[PDB]
Design an enzyme around this catalytic site. Structure first.
Site, mmCIF file in Angstrom:
data_model
loop_
_atom_site.group_PDB
_atom_site.id
_atom_site.type_symbol
_atom_site.label_atom_id
_atom_site.label_comp_id
_atom_site.label_asym_id
_atom_site.label_seq_id
_atom_site.Cartn_x
_atom_site.Cartn_y
_atom_site.Cartn_z
ATOM 1 N N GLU A 39 0.815 -1.213 0.017
ATOM 2 C CA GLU A 39 -0.092 -0.076 0.054
ATOM 3 C C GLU A 39 0.935 1.130 0.144
ATOM 4 O O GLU A 39 1.894 1.387 0.683
ATOM 5 C CB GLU A 39 -0.950 0.043 1.150
ATOM 6 C CG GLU A 39 -1.540 1.443 1.268
ATOM 7 C CD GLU A 39 -2.893 1.507 2.258
ATOM 8 O OE1 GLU A 39 -2.740 0.806 3.468
ATOM 9 O OE2 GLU A 39 -3.580 2.354 2.237
ATOM 10 N N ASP A 104 9.442 6.314 15.231
ATOM 11 C CA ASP A 104 9.288 7.671 14.860
ATOM 12 C C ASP A 104 9.527 8.379 16.102
ATOM 13 O O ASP A 104 8.605 8.121 17.103
ATOM 14 C CB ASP A 104 7.635 7.717 14.575
ATOM 15 C CG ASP A 104 7.336 9.104 14.001
ATOM 16 O OD1 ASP A 104 7.997 10.017 14.097
ATOM 17 O OD2 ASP A 104 5.803 9.262 13.790
ATOM 18 N N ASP A 106 8.913 12.374 17.261
ATOM 19 C CA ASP A 106 8.638 13.609 17.075
ATOM 20 C C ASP A 106 9.009 14.754 18.072
ATOM 21 O O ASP A 106 8.871 14.498 19.324
ATOM 22 C CB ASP A 106 7.232 13.620 17.025
ATOM 23 C CG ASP A 106 6.400 12.913 15.933
ATOM 24 O OD1 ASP A 106 7.243 13.196 14.864
ATOM 25 O OD2 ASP A 106 5.623 12.245 16.071
#
EC number: 2.7.7.-
Length: 396
Positions: A39, A104, A106
């Site tokens: 995807e 991840d 941030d």
């Protein structure tokens, strides 16, 4: 204000490394399920968002992205059928088989503990939190999991993304990714109000990580960032990390009475006040407890803060490397612990450079492309060598 549709179109047509990204995700030059069933999601300047795209080849990948000209695109899982054949449609239906293990970080998650920027802004000073996040995460990846094929990539704005391509990492189920996360996500309720009260004795990974981070604590937290000179912030995020109401209350009063004492002064006050308060017969037990709280505080401030669901979910979509960030104009380049965010190539600058030099290959982005090609080549070797190890095991 984002860069124009034409700048984006021309970036895709001329510089985006479609071949190397395709090969990275396919794990071979020859198209396989690893790309054909993968995807991609695309996000557009307008807010539209299109899931369940999939590409068959480098040329198909390039074509569809050029044609759609999205602001960014996101990579997802490898499925049992092609995602673009969803709609028509329901085998049982569409099932996720595998995907790179991702992490991840941030920077806005560190906003309690940094002062030089807040929110989606960063700089070289607070980027040190990302570099430490890499050091720690890389140590667990290599030493404890023995993963070897991973890369960090700048997110374009707020932080960095780690992509783990090792076969056995890709194979992880949702539960196993939650167990990986749990192992690396030492810090719980991303406080305050309260104390981490991490378990003890420290698990070996915590012990290691503490020892890795402690040498940075005074310089980064007490000196550079100094988040606790502001008294309300010390009361909100420093004191709740301590174990004793009386100590908390005494420090609180002292700083209320003597305001704006630096983070270094406050860090020392903790010790001095606890010393006067607890000298006694049980002073040894308070000495230990306070130390534990301060160690936990080192972890709370410097240990990687992960965006947890990104890691836990096999199907999770994450931005592709080398996308442009429309807010900043930055290219989402591969990086290491030497990276300055001020050092990311900007799309406008690259397009000027390539015209100035009348050559697509003569931009500041080329060295990042070359290094990524080299990384990918190594991955492809290892993937093939793994089936060669299957043969070598079968050679009996």
């Amino acid at each position: 204000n984002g860069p124009s549709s034409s700048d984006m179109e021309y970036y895709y047509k001329s510089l985006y490394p479609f071949k190397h990204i395709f090969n990275w995700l396919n794990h071979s030059p020859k198209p396989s399920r690893d790309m054909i069933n993968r995807e991609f999601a695309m996000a557009f300047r307008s807010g539209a968002y299109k899931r369940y795209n999939s590409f068959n080849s480098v040329q198909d990948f390039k074509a569809q992205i050029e044609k759609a000209n999205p602001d960014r695109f996101e990579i997802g899982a490898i499925y049992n059928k092609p995602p673009r054949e969803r709609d028509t449609l329901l085998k049982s239906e569409l099932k996720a088989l595998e995907k790179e293990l991702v992490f991840d970080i941030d920077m806005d998650d560190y906003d309690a503990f940094r002062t030089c920027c807040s929110g989606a802004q960063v700089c070289s000073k607070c980027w040190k939190f990302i570099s430490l996040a890499m050091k720690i995460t890389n140590t667990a990846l290599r030493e404890d999991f023995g993963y070897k094929d991973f890369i960090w990539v700048f997110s374009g704005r707020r932080g960095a993304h780690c992509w783990v391509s090792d076969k056995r990492a890709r194979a992880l189920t949702d539960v196993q990714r939650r167990n990986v996360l749990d192992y690396v996500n030492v810090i719980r309720d991303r406080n305050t109000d309260k104390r981490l009260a991490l378990k003890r004795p420290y698990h070996p990974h915590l012990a290691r990580s503490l020892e890795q981070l402690k040498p940075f604590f005074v310089s980064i937290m007490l000196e550079e960032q100094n988040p606790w000179e502001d008294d309300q912030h010390a009361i909100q995020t420093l004191l709740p990390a301590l174990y004793d109401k009386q100590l908390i209350d005494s420090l609180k009063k002292y700083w209320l009475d003597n305001p704006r004492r630096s983070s270094k002064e406050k860090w020392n006050d903790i010790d001095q006040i606890a010393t006067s308060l607890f000298k006694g017969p049980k002073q040894d037990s308070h000495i230990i407890k306070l130390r534990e709280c301060k160690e936990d505080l080192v972890l709370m401030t410097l240990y990687p803060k992960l965006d947890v669901e990104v890691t836990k979910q096999t199907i999770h979509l994450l931005k592709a490397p080398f996308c442009i960030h429309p807010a900043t104009g930055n290219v989402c380049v591969p990086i290491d612990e030497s990276f300055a965010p001020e050092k990311a190539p900007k799309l406008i600058d690259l397009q000027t450079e390539m015209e100035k030099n009348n050559d697509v290959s003569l931009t500041a982005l080329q060295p990042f492309i070359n290094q990524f090609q080299a990384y990918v080549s190594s991955l492809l070797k290892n993937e093939l060598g793994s089936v060669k190890r299957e043969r070598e095991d079968d050679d009996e």
